[PDB]
A = this chain, B = another copy of it.
Amino acid sequence: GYISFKANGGVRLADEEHLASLLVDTNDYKGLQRAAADLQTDMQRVTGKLPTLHSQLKDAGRHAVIIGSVGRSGLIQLLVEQNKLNVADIEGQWEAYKLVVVDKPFPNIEKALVIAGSDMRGAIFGVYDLSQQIGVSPWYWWADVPVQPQSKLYVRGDTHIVEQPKVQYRGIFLNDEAPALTNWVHANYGNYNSQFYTQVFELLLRLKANFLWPAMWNNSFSVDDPLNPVLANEYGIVMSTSHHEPMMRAHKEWHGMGRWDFTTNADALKQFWREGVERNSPYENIITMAMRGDGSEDANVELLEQIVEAQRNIIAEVFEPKGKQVTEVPQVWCLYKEVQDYYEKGMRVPDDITLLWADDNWGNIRRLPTAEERKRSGGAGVYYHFDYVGGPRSYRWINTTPLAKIWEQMHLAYKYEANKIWIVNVGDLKPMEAPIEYFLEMAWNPEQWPKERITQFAELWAEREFGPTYAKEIAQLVQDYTQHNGRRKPELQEAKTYSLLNYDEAARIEQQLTDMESRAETLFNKIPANQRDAYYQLVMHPVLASATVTKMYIAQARNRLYAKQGRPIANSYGQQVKELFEKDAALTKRYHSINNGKWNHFMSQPHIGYTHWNNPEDNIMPVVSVVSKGNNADMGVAVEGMEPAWPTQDVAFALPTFTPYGKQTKILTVFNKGVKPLKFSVSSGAAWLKVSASSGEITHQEMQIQVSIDWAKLPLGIHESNVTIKGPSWVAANIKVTANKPAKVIPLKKLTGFVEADGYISFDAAATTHSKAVDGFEWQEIPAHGRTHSSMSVYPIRDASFAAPANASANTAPQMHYSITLLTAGEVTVEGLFAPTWPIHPERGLRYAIAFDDQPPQIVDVLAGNSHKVWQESVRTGVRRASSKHTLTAGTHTMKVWAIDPAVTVQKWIIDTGELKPSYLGPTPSPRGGK
């Protein structure tokens, strides 16, 4: 950046006793003067010394910061008049600022940093740019991020920065606010009054945002404190309402006036709306239009048109005497659900009204502008969710939105030109600090944050708050817990989520999570003391809390399964459920206790015990089973991959089939259902079948027998034998083992591509062997996207579809090629895992084409078979799925994928060759041959 912490011949903001003078015209915007005053205290935070703030150039010292708007600063204007400054690059622009150094701007001033803005907010944003660069995080108060001391602050002489936003209105919606934000606000401020809201306004400005929808569950912004809109307007925050709160009226303001129904109560509604728009007319707003009524298709469309027409006439009547026409008063309409269909079927919407497109409440944008809609003077915007109360189930507790998910969807919005308004539902605001800042930095300029800077954003954020030493590790912790929560909201997690039986999924997840926790715990003791509060609330708490909920359900799953199997070890897992549940409570209490209880109530959202879409009233520890012991030695055997334990009537006991490149060692677990010593023998029925022990003895512990194959002693083809385990009882346990060796087993080093094992071939979409670009379009990797690794998608963004390929050599579109080795000849099923995206362009699907070798390509639409139930499952799991069937010979093959429609974004491919088993995430990527 442009700030140096040692002398550099530039502008001297601070150097020991010497501090630059801050200059702002007392006739400039009050909101800019206020921001200048914040810069004054910011510099004291950094240097320990308070710089002076003057309005007259004559009172300035040798070095100065000259702050002003082009329109109202006598300082900026004098510099322009005397050609010390040119503002042609910002003049007339929306929220632009220029930071430049000027030599001898005035006789008593040697050097000045000039901060010039096109308008009030432009100048404010330039001021807070400087605040952050000298070391004051936007989150210095809102997340206790310490301000690193500096005795020296210098501005580079060649500094020349010209900035302005790409999205015109950028901000947040405080929502889902009880119990957490609401009980904190009431404890600290009494209510959602202007002492609370000025803390919110300041945060938004420091993040270069300008837009707010206020808390409305049980509050009315303009009524609860008349200074709320006055201070919003003075600060520079543009106010609006959520999209079912029309005409500047909060939801709760409608009382004692009859039914919310325009067909029967229009006069009352119209007077209510008129007085609302009149009341807030002194302030900078965007007015919400239309309405959702309470209690025929052509009748609906007609009614909505009447309503909007009536609202337009109200606005005209209010603002006409104030010298404004209806087309000069910002207005917004969210065309939501059926209303979108109304609109596509020809409903009329005045051209100047902004069309706000909503996501699906789960981070997937439902609709974006078409080529013809982009011509509307009102433009369009996006309303996005980080938090939601509704179906299929609420998620309200901690951050569950990975940065890369945000990137991929908001980049589509940017490219399809929904750039009038970007607003995100932040729930209680905390603990969404990182994705809030990402969303708003992206809104400022999406081109400054391309997909190759997704990881870098998190690293840079961590470096700013905590310093460089552990920045990479801290960024990775955040990327890791958010990716994990992106797999399934904590509220939606349960015992059955991660598989105990297949591909060691629950065990792998538990280990991942535990390693994340250990990293987070360890750093707590290594960072400086004044970082601990910030670190706890921004990193350690969400990591430990996220891990604890999942581990709790995995322990529950084990308690339940092992109890069904009759294993007394089940009780130890029941004890683990209790410990993890208690740990969840202890973490919440810690969050409520740090920094003398500053953040008490913010983690009070219930998140354990959901049985339907709405939260329980409190956390409830999950149900556990209790296994009793007998007395005499009594043997059971648990078999890897199976729910029933031996002995069980009418069950064929078998280990999963061994394959040459699959899992090589599998477990039989012998256990005692009594207390007296249990002696047993173990024998194999074939020379190729190996067991790790020939006998054992146990009392209250279990014993694992490892089973494996000697492939050299196994004939070609499919063969079966038994492991026999003989305990005290005269009936021995016989566990069948099968091994399939279709041919001589070539060493993996000498194979090509991803190799079939254990009934499947699995690989990340980015693990291509070749990529072919066509007409400047190419499948490219989105780092850290999706549930397990990354995704691929076509860039640049098209607003047209490629032709499907006629044959498997057609170069109609960019392609991805993969290499595989198939052992099992026959029909395979290739499933892709995709971002759960919508048909954001009417009547256009999410098609791709796929073929092996020179077989005729098949067209697959990810959205084929779409339904409400299919959509529900796409947001519960975080992916959409699509598949195709192919017949292949044994040997090597090339899988080919062609792009067709835009916005198809694929993370993983899973090929079922016949024996694929269910899991939440799919098997981990297959063995890969040595080239």
Contact = CB atoms under 8 A, between A and B. Distances in A.
Contacts of A269: none
A367 interface: no
Given A392-B649, A611-B647, A649-B611, A625 B623 contact: yes
Interface string A614-638: 1011111111111111111110000
A623 B673 contact: no
Nearest to A636: B611
Contacts of A617: 630, 632-634, 673-674, 728-729
Nearest to A731: B614
A614 B616 CA distance: 46
A613 interface: yes
A622 B674 CA distance: 13
A759 interface: no
A616 B628 contact: no
B623 A627 contact: yes
A626 to B, nearest CB: 5
A292 interface: no
A903 to B, nearest CB: 30
Contacts of A564: 623
A592 to B, nearest CB: 15
A887 to B, nearest CB: 37
Interface in A576-619: 609, 611-614, 616-619
A850 to B, nearest CB: 34
A478 interface: no
B621 A624 contact: no
Contacts of A649: 392-393, 611-613
A743 to B, nearest CB: 37
Contacts of A204: none
A582 to B, nearest CB: 11
Contacts of A609: 630, 673
A636 to B, nearest CB: 8
A840 interface: no
Contacts of A611: 566, 647-649
Contacts of A629: 620
A674 B618 contact: yes
A559 to B, nearest CB: 10
A136 interface: no
Given A566-B620, A729-B614, A731-B614, A625 B625 contact: yes
A628 B552 CA distance: 15
Given A611-B647, A673-B616, A728-B617, A628 B634 contact: no
A563 interface: yes
Contacts of A563: 623
A673 B673 CA distance: 34
B630 A619 contact: yes
B624 A630 contact: no
B648 A630 contact: no
A732 B729 CA distance: 56
Interface string A372-393: 0000000000000000000011
B624 A625 contact: yes
A728 B627 CA distance: 36
A213 to B, nearest CB: 22
A248 to B, nearest CB: 26
Contacts of A392: 649
Contacts of A612: 647-649
Interface in A45-75: none
Nearest to A634: B617
Interface string A641-652: 000000111000
A726 to B, nearest CB: 14
Contact of A618 (B620, B623, B624, B632): B632
Interface string A126-151: 00000000000000000000000000
Contacts of A624: 625-626
Given A563-B623, A566-B611, A630 B618 contact: yes
Given A614-B729, A647-B611, A673 B620 contact: yes
Interface in A520-578: 563-564, 566, 574
Contacts of A632: 617-618
Contacts of A647: 611-612, 614
Nearest to A649: B612
Contacts of A614: 647, 729, 731
Contacts of A634: 616-618, 620
A874 to B, nearest CB: 16
A254 to B, nearest CB: 17
Contacts of A621: 628
Nearest to A727: B617
A628 B623 contact: yes
Interface string A725-758: 0001101000000000000000000000000000
A392 B648 CA distance: 12
Contacts of A731: 614
A843 to B, nearest CB: 31
A617 B648 CA distance: 15
Given A612-B647, A616-B630, 16 more contacts: A563-B623, A566-B623, A611-B648, A611-B649, A612-B649, A614-B647, A616-B634, A617-B633, A617-B673, A618-B632, A620-B630, A622-B628, A623-B626, A624-B625, A625-B625, A626-B626
Task: Give the top 7 A-B pairs by smallest Cβ distance, nearest first.
Answer: A618-B630, A621-B628, A617-B634, A617-B632, A612-B647, A618-B632, A612-B649
25 contacts: A392-B649, A393-B649, A609-B630, A611-B647, A612-B647, A612-B648, A613-B649, A614-B729, A614-B731, A616-B630, A616-B673, A617-B633, A617-B673, A617-B674, A618-B630, A618-B631, A618-B632, A618-B674, A619-B630, A620-B628, A620-B630, A620-B673, A621-B628, A622-B628, A626-B626
